[PDB]
Design a protein around this ligand. Structure first.
Ligand code: CLA
Ligand code: CLA
Ligand code: CLA
Ligand SMILES: C=Cc1c(C)c2cc3nc(c4c5[nH]c(cc6nc(cc1[nH]2)C(C)=C6CC)c(C)c5C(=O)[C@@H]4C(=O)OC)[C@@H](CCC(=O)OC/C=C(\C)CCC[C@H](C)CCC[C@H](C)CCCC(C)C)[C@@H]3C
Ligand SMILES: CC(C)=CCC/C(C)=C/CC/C(C)=C/CC/C(C)=C/CC/C(C)=C/CC/C(C)=C/CC/C(C)=C/CC/C(C)=C/CC/C(C)=C/CC1=CC(=O)C(C)=C(C)C1=O
Ligand SMILES: CCCCCCCCCCCCCCCCCC(=O)OC[C@H](CO[C@@H]1O[C@H](CO)[C@H](O)[C@H](O)[C@H]1O)OC(=O)CCCCCCCCCCCCCCCCC
Ligand SMILES: CCCCCCCCCCCCCCCCCC(=O)OC[C@H](CO[C@@H]1O[C@H](CO)[C@H](O)[C@H](O)[C@H]1O)OC(=O)CCCCCCCCCCCCCCCCC
Ligand SMILES: CCCCCCCCCCCCCCCC(=O)OC[C@H](COP(=O)(O)OC[C@@H](O)CO)OC(=O)CCCCCCCCCCCCCCC
Ligand SMILES: CC1=C(/C=C/C(C)=C/C=C/C(C)=C/C=C/C=C(C)/C=C/C=C(C)/C=C/C2=C(C)CCCC2(C)C)C(C)(C)CCC1
Ligand SMILES: CC1=C(/C=C/C(C)=C/C=C/C(C)=C/C=C/C=C(C)/C=C/C=C(C)/C=C/C2=C(C)CCCC2(C)C)C(C)(C)CCC1
Ligand SMILES: CC1=C(/C=C/C(C)=C\C=C\C(C)=C\C=C\C=C(C)\C=C\C=C(C)\C=C\C2=C(C)CCCC2(C)C)C(C)(C)CCC1
Ligand SMILES: CC1=C(\C=C/C(C)=C/C=C/C(C)=C/C=C/C=C(C)/C=C/C=C(C)/C=C/C2=C(C)CCCC2(C)C)C(C)(C)CCC1
Lengths: 37, 30, 348, 480, 68, 31, 30, 75, 30, 36, 27, 48
């Protein structure tokens, strides 16, 4: 029990955010018609 | 339609919330 | 005298006289608060002492007629008047006084003058806060009682058929109003009333805990057992240990306050929110928008004769209240219920 | 920095972002209007305009469009059931599309104004600091408002250039969009007089133009300027909140109590029409006139329009619904199909009996058959009680005049009891609670929902006014 | 530092230029008070007419006004 | 003499004593 | 179905209470 | 003039000893002479039920209530 | 049992939760 | 041009707990009425 | 309401594209 | 039974996350974290 040396922080720049949002929305657009059947 | 609508809503919301949380964590430290 | 150092006029002299410090602070808002509140109290007392309700409600409500403090009230006007302002010079009373008092106008007089007195009182709180140079949180707190009064005594009767269904200024009259809401509106089941009662009980709880915690964490600032005397109002040192109270309540309950400002603001915030939500609920009731029944359970009970829950028993009790009380509560309907149609437990 | 409830305070000290944010809110409002119009047009069923009107199907924005002239639709149907000769550009779909396009244009303007916030217009040349002359801005905006009010009153409502407003007969039978001649007399202040609207708007536009010119020319007094903090932007917020909640209270009152601006064809009948038996008295007057003229009961009761009988029904009362009984009025008690005709109850002796109508308060009311004098002659013995005045014991019979069941006479005690239970609610109608799977419990008309929402919003805005005025008056202590 | 310059901004500059100027003394406060009193009287008249507490022969105060 | 304190005290007191006498009188009327 | 929703809501509320009691921000300079 | 000085002065005592009992007897006479029943319209304990109605009154119309209340009261 | 009630409850549970998590992460990172 | 009026919103853990508790309690209270 | 959700998804994608075009971070 | 096992494993995971600086994972010679992968493989294969 002490400060763990393996300490790191995750980062995500704006370009990555846009890529992720676009991927999610495109996948939803592609699969919504199939899921609603 | 309940199954499909619920699945679509969750898939839209949860990953977007995760990505937004990560980005806001990133953008805080200039 | 102002920013540009200009002359003085009537307004300046009036302002200097009105704001002059004395035993009874008048202020600009005093011209509105004092006469309105005085006449509200006077009307209530002279109505509960001499005026009757025989012609408006068919009841005897006064000290002259033989009623005590608990069963005396200033009853609302008759349902025939609907939402008439009912001035003493109005078409209903035609300028007569004894007819006006006999006709129920005294309730409208008391209610209107009291509402304007409440407005004047909040204005006075604002004036005092400005004079002393303090944030006027007291007026923000007092906003909730005005909201409750407006919702119950003004908005609800306006939403209904007339002033007749407003609360009457009396103890037994208020109890009648409460039971009427229980029987007809199912007011206990409305979520807004639930949030209001939660807020009120939480405010009482916060008051009790704050008082006990402060009085049980004092610093030994003097000798003897009487701790009340060991306090100097001009001292600049805290009179109780915040750290000890924080530790005690964090170890007993799990979470404890650590900021005095946040604690006292929470004490301010809980009851105000509770009564504001109650006022919104009453506003909803004014239009018969009742959270009366649950459709699923009603359908299940109708379909299945063996299905019983406390909700259905409450529904039956409400039906009994309505049927057995509307005969004399609302004379203008001239309801004559035969004894064989009144709901009744068949077991007897 | 700032807590979660002060995040919008960063816009207080610069006008450009204020313009951008107000544009964003206006765009959101316009988008909501367009989307709601499209949704209601998608859901609306114009098949039956006499027994399934707009207020019966839970339409909210559709009556507001209909009130000012928009009646036709691109689908080939009018609001009166007639075919659309020429829908024109100004149709329901056209209005919705126009609102959406306006929302988009406002959004783009908001983005542009947010991007370019530093403008020399907002800087005073004397000190080079962002400052707004609030009295002159108020003067300009008041002049514009007065001009618009006068234009709307004189050219649209009057019908000189615009189509006009909706005008209907007192009983709401034949109402159409008609031009109104403004009434300058005392009757112009009657709320049920349509010409009062035009007269008010013309006079208020003239006075607003004059006041705008005055506030544009004359500068405020120093005592007034410092007393009301005319140099601060927050006092304008407090005064505006006061004005808007006053307006909301007035509008909610007019909607609840009925006026010429809320026709019953669009928002449904009111509570006090049922409380005072308005349509019941009109129907009785018509029946008595027909009988005095000389005709059989069936002929007299067959001349009553089904619309007038439909208005005389507890189901259409706005004060019979519930807070969480969501949906249209059709979803509770079904969709009206036809009129079953007036029901008359007579005992074995031939004495005429009437059912005591249900008051608005009572969720459940016992059924009582009483004679002309007022003495109860029969009643249903609760649920499982024994009675001396039961329906079968007295032998009550029901005859139907007019409607679908005209001429019939039932004597089965179960049938008589059922029809008495259905007639205590007013006129008897046929419903099909199968298409929408109706629950059977009453809902509330758009009148009640609008009144509830706007009274609640006004009540909350009262506290808003109190808080913002307190912040304005006590700015020095609040800031530091 | 100077702000952005636009022809529309140049046109509209005089409207926002005269900022902070006041009229010395009490100005036209008495006229404002008179107008406020008149408006209060007018609002009372409207409220009483609508409330049926002030009956005028011309007005009917009911739906039958639509029958005129 | 006619200060605001006098006005308030007397305006609250005179009706109070008048009504107290009235109530005491009403205590004795037979029903 | 609705019973499951109510149970989930109550369990979530209890979990939030537990986290607030235990995983709290340590108070400094009371 | 502190309240201690107000109480001490004998002028206040002598001017109040002639007025307080006057107000008390005024109220007692107001009740006893029956003026209260007349000015406020409160029915006397014998006129609650007149032979014309024998029941509680019920006002019907607001505009003509002026005559109706008096005809119901028997006045 | 209606889809509207379930979806309204789900949205009301999730969206404010995501907003609060965003703000808390922003605060903690700073 | 950069805006001088720049500020950041903060929300400590206590505020997060309060908000989560508030929304969950509101959902618990109103779920019975919404489902009906 | 399937057309409604399809349109909402398409409009969301278009909005993401617009924001990526016009609100990209500086290099 | 599976649900109870899942809860117990959750508690054990929390404990093992909280306390990580165990002397068991430290090399006796160097004093640094190490794992003797062949021997762990032997033990786990024996158990399997
Ligand atoms: C010129 C553009 C334009 C036009 C022609 C319309 C036309 C219409 N709109 Mg749209 N709308 C517009 C712009 C426009 N709108 C914009 C910019 C917005 C965003 C704010 C909206 C948002 C909007 C919504 C949200 C709704 C409409 C609705 C409507 C319809 C009913 C209008 C109505 O009843 O108003 C009545 C208007 C009032 C009662 C306003 C009263 C104003 C108060 C009294 C002024 C008081 C302050 C004043 C300044 C004091 C001084 C007075 C005097 C001294 C000068 C109608 C088809 C409704 C509808 O059914 O369509 C879907 C609807 O729900 N509109
Ligand atoms: C002044 C505002 C206003 C008014 C009067 C109306 C009135 C109406 N609307 Mg419209 N609507 C509005 C704003 C308004 N709407 C807005 C802003 C939206 C966008 C979200 C909609 C979207 C909308 C749709 C999609 C539909 C309606 C429908 C209706 C009708 C039925 C209303 C109903 O079921 O009550 C329901 C009333 C309540 C549920 C009471 C809620 C009040 C409390 C305070 C809510 C508190 C919730 C709280 C946060 C806790 C949440 C817990 C969680 C589990 C959810 C009625 C004509 C329906 C209809 O028949 O029209 C075709 C319909 O299908 N409206
Ligand atoms: C014309 C209307 C108006 C305007 C322009 C403002 C503007 C402002 N208010 Mg005021 N206020 C108003 C009405 C208004 N308020 C009303 C009606 C109330 C009573 C409820 C208040 C009560 C109030 C308080 C108590 C405080 C403010 C504060 C503020 C400032 C910051 C607000 C902020 O960042 O919130 C940001 C809000 C959020 C990030 C979340 C809000 C979420 C709620 C639940 C609304 C959810 C959206 C809602 C459902 C959309 C529908 C709205 C409805 C009207 C249709 C800003 C100057 C604050 C201030 O000045 O601090 C210095 C402050 O302390 N206001
Ligand atoms: C029944 C409960 C109740 C009562 C009796 C009450 C009474 C009072 N609270 C006051 C204050 C406050 N109350 C506050 C919060 C609250 N108050 C609450 C509940 C109450 N508060 C609750 C629940 C809250 C939480 C939000 C605050 C924050 C304040 C103050 O600042 C203020 C104070 O300083 O307290 C000392 C005083 C205002 C005096 C006044 O208006 O003078 C003027 C007199 C007027 C306007 C005449 C009243 C006219 C009324 C409306 C009609 C006539 C009523 C009859 C005369 C009596 C009827 C008798 C009944 C049996 C029906 C007064 C002592
Ligand atoms: C299976 C299961 C679980 C079944 C159970 C189902 C069931 C019935 C669930 C109940 C559902 C439920 C929760 C219903 C309630 C719904 C409801 C009515 C919600 C109200 C919602 C709401 C918005 C209300 C508005 C009013 C409002 C804001 C109320 C808040 C009330 C509130 C939290 C009050 C405070 C209570 C409280 C315990 C305070 C203690 C404070 C405290 C620790 C002080 C200690 C302290 C004191 C000092 O003096 C000093 C100096 C220090 C330092 C110090 O520390
Ligand atoms: C917080 C606000 C600040 C504090 C305010 C303190 C009180 C200020 C004074 C209030 C005065 C109220 C005057 C009474 C109005 C009145 O009698 O209405 C009664 C009248 C209507 O009158 C009704 O008309 C009906 C028509 O079918 C029927 O004939 C009814 O029989 C008849 O009573 O309404 C008005 O006069 C004003 C109309 C607008 C009212 C807005 C406020 C109330 C809104 C309530 C909406 C329903 C809920
Ligand atoms: C923070 C919020 C973040 C997002 C959360 C998303 C949910 C927000 C909260 C939603 C609350 C309402 C849920 C209703 C669920 C439902 O079943 O609706 C169901 C209804 C529709 O109901 C359907 O109607 C159909 C016919 O159209 C059929 O009849 C169906 O049978 C029927 O289910 O949806 C609505 O009513 C939407 C309108 C909601 C607004 C009504 C007006 C409110 C006016 C008062 C506002 C102020 C109140 C006081 C404020 C203080
Ligand atoms: C043996 C006893 C075991 C524990 C008993 C139960 C303890 C429960 C404690 C819950 C506290 C939750 C606080 C969260 C938020 C939180 O972490 O608060 C933290 C807060 C202290 O905040 P601070 O003073 O540190 O704030 C400093 C400021 O600068 C910022 O806030 O404590 C309070 O406000 C006291 C009020 C508690 C009020 C609790 C009401 C009861 C819970 C609600 C009802 C639950 C119903 C459940 C139905 C299923
Ligand atoms: C100032 C101001 C204001 C206001 C303004 C206004 C709006 C004004 C208006 C005003 C007005 C608008 C007024 C009016 C008035 C009217 C009147 C006053 C009337 C009267 C009438 C009469 C008197 C009549 C009588 C008669 C009859 C009834 C008939 C027969 C004959 C005889 C003669 C008998 C405000 C608040 C906003 C803000 C602040 C500023
Ligand atoms: C979407 C999807 C997916 C995924 C899925 C998943 C992954 C899921 C998961 C799920 C999960 C993973 C779930 C879980 C759950 C859990 C639970 C539910 C638990 C519970 C527990 C409990 C309840 C306990 C309790 C307790 C304890 C703690 C101990 C003691 C006792 C008691 C009882 C108290 C994929 C991609 C593949 C594809 C397909 C679809
Ligand atoms: C813009 C535009 C566009 C597009 C559009 C689209 C395609 C869509 C939209 C869509 C949408 C879709 C919109 C919307 C909006 C909405 C809103 C704006 C809403 C709001 C709501 C609210 C506000 C509510 C509230 C509440 C709740 C939550 C519940 C109940 C209660 C209360 C009222 C509180 C474009 C670019 C192409 C072109 C131009 C124009
Ligand atoms: C209305 C009016 C009028 C008249 C008159 C007046 C204003 C009066 C007032 C009056 C008053 C203002 C009165 C008062 C009274 C008071 C009293 C009467 C009190 C009593 C008390 C008592 C009795 C107590 C008791 C007790 C207690 C609580 C404590 C101890 C115990 C015992 C139990 C002893 C006129 C028409 C001209 C005008 C308008 C207004």
């Amino acid at each position: 029990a002490r400060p763990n040396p393996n300490k790191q922080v995750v980062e995500l720049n704006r370009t990555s955010l846009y890529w992720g949002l676009l991927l999610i929305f495109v996948l939803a657009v592609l699969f919504s018609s199939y899921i609603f059947n | 339609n309940i199954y499909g609508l619920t699945a679509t809503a969750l898939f839209i919301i949860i990953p977007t919330s995760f990505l937004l949380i990560l980005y806001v964590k990133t953008a805080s430290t200039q | 005298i102002g920013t540009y150092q200009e002359k003085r006029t009537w307004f300046d002299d009036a302002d200097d006289w009105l704001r002059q410090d004395r035993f009874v602070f008048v202020g600009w808002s005093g011209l509105l608060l004092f006469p309105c509140a005085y006449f509200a109290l006077g009307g209530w007392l002279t109505g509960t002492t001499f005026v009757t309700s025989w012609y408006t409600h068919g009841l005897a409500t006064s000290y002259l007629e033989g009623c005590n403090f608990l069963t005396a009230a200033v009853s609302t006007p008759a349902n025939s008047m609907a939402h008439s302002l009912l001035f003493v010079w109005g078409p209903e009373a035609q300028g007569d006084f004894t007819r006006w008092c006999q006709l129920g106008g005294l309730w409208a007089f008391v209610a209107l003058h009291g509402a304007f007195g409440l407005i004047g009182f909040m204005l006075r709180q604002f004036e005092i806060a400005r004079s002393v140079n303090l944030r006027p949180y007291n007026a923000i707190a007092f906003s909730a009682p005005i909201a409750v009064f407006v919702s119950v005594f003004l908005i609800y009767p306006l939403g209904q058929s007339g002033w007749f269904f407003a609360p009457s200024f009396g103890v037994a009259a208020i109890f009648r109003f409460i039971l009427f809401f229980q029987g007809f509106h199912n007011w206990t089941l409305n979520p807004f009333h639930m949030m209001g009662v939660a807020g009120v009980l939480g405010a009482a709880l916060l008051c009790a805990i704050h008082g006990a915690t402060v009085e049980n964490t004092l610093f030994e600032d003097g000798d003897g057992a009487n701790t009340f005397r060991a306090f100097n109002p001009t001292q600049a040192e805290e009179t109780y240990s915040m750290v000890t109270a924080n530790r005690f309540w964090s170890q007993i309950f799990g979470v404890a306050f650590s900021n005095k400002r946040w604690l006292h603001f929470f004490m301010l915030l809980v009851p105000v929110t509770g009564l504001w939500m109650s006022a919104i609920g009453v506003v909803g009731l004014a239009l018969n928008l009742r959270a009366y029944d649950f459709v699923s359970q009603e359908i299940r009970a109708a379909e299945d004769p063996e299905f019983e829950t406390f909700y259905t028993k409450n529904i039956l009790l409400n039906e009994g209240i309505r049927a057995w009380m509307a005969a004399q509560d609302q004379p203008h309907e001239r309801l004559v219920f035969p004894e064989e149609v009144l709901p009744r437990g068949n077991a007897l | 920095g700032l807590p979660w409830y002060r995040v919008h305070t960063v816009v207080i000290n610069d006008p450009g972002r204020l313009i951008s944010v107000h544009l964003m809110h206006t765009a959101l409002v316009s988008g909501w209007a367009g989307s709601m119009a499209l949704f209601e047009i998608s859901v609306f069923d114009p098949s039956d305009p006499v027994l399934n009107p707009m207020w019966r199907q839970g339409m909210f924005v559709l009556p507001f469009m209909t009130r000012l002239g928009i009646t036709q639709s691109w689908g080939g149907w009018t609001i009166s059931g007639e075919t659309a000769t020429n829908p024109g550009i100004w149709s329901y779909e056209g209005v919705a599309a126009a609102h959406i396009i306006l929302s988009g244009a406002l959004f783009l303007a908001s983005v542009w104004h947010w991007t370019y916030w530093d403008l020399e217009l907002f800087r005073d040349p004397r000190t080079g600091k962002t400052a707004l002359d609030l009295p002159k801005i108020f003067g300009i905006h008041l002049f514009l408002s007065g001009l618009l009010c006068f234009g709307f009153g004189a050219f649209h409502v009057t019908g000189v250039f615009g189509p006009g407003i909706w005008v209907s007969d007192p009983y709401g039978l034949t109402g159409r969009v008609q031009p109104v001649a403004p009434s300058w007399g005392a009757d112009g202040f009657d709320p049920y007089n349509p010409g009062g609207i035009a007269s008010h708007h013309i006079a208020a536009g003239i006075l607003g133009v004059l006041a705008g010119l005055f506030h544009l020319c004359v500068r405020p007094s120093i005592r007034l300027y410092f007393g009301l903090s005319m140099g601060s932007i927050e006092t304008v917020l407090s005064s505006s909140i006061a004005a808007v909640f006053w307006a909301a209270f007035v509008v909610a009152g007019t909607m609840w109590y009925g006026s010429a601006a809320t026709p019953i064809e669009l928002f449904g009948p009111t509570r006090y029409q049922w409380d005072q038996g308005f349509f019941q008295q009109e129907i009785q007057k018509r029946v008595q006139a027909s009988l005095a003229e000389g005709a059989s009961l069936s002929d007299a009761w067959s001349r009553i329009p089904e619309k007038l009988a439909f208005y005389d029904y507890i189901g259409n009362n706005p004060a019979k619904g519930g807070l969480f009984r969501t949906g249209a009025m059709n979803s509770g008690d079904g969709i009206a199909v036809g009129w079953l005709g007036h029901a008359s109850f007579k005992d074995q002796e031939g004495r005429e009996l009437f059912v005591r109508r249900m008051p608005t308060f009572f969720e459940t009311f016992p059924v009582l058959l009483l004679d002309k004098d007022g003495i109860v002659r029969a009643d249903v013995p609760f649920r499982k009680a024994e009675s001396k005045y039961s329906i079968e014991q007295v032998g009550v019979s029901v005859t139907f005049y007019g409607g679908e069941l005209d001429g019939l006479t039932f004597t089965d005690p179960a049938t008589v009891k059922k029809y008495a239970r259905k007639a205590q609610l007013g006129e008897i109608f046929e419903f099909d609670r199968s298409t929408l799977q109706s629950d059977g419990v009453f809902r509330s008309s758009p009148r009640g929902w609008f009144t509830f929402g706007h009274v609640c919003f006004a009540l909350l805005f009262f506290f808003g006014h109190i808080w913002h005025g307190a912040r304005t008056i006590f700015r020095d202590v609040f800031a530091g | 530092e100077p702000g952005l310059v636009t022809p529309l901004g140049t046109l509209l500059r005089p409207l926002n230029s005269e900022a902070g100027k006041v009229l010395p003394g009490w100005g036209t406060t008495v006229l404002m008070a008179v107008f406020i009193l008149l408006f209060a009287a007018f609002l009372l008249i409207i409220l009483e007419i609508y409330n049926s507490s002030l009956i005028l022969d011309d007005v009917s105060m009911s739906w039958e006004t639509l029958a005129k | 003499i006619f200060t605001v304190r006098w006005l308030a005290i007397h305006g609250i007191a005179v009706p109070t004593i008048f009504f107290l006498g009235a109530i005491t009188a009403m205590q004795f009327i037979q029903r | 179905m609705e019973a499951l929703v109510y149970t989930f809501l109550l369990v979530g509320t209890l979990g939030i209470i537990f986290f607030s009691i235990f995983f709290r921000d340590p108070p400094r300079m009371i | 003039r502190p309240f201690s000085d107000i109480l001490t002065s004998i002028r206040y005592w002598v001017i109040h000893s002639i007025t307080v009992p006057a107000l008390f007897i005024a109220g007692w006479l107001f009740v006893s002479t029956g003026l209260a029943y007349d000015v406020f319209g409160t029915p006397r304990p014998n006129e609650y039920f007149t032979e014309d109605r024998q029941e509680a009154p019920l006002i019907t119309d607001r505009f003509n209530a002026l005559e109706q209340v008096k005809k119901l009261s028997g006045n």
